[PDB]
């Protein structure tokens, strides 16, 4: 409201009147917290597609690493 003559949380209905994507590796003991993938955080035009591709790549790499772990253990 007016600054000089000081209406806190008037309930401001925002439903009467009218997605985000992360790098998929925020919380994972295998994904390094620090890495060059951090630079993906400053991409805007194709953020959805770039992060989707990154998520797919990390999914596949983790799955293949786990498959090798199981194969090495069993062999």
């Amino acid at each position: 409201g007016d600054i000089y003559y000081d209406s806190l949380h008037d309930r401001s209905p925002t439903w009467m009147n009218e997605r985000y994507d992360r790098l998929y590796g925020v919380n994972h003991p295998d994904i390094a917290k620090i890495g060059i993938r951090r630079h993906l955080n400053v991409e805007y035009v194709n953020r959805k597609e770039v992060v989707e591709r990154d998520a797919a790549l990390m999914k596949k790499t983790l799955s293949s690493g786990r498959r090798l772990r199981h194969r090495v253990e069993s062999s």
Partner: peptide, 12 residues
């Protein structure tokens, strides 16, 4: 206080 529409119509 007043909501947005209440304020709008009071000003009207």
């Amino acid at each position: 206080e007043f909501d947005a529409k209440g304020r709008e119509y009071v000003q009207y």
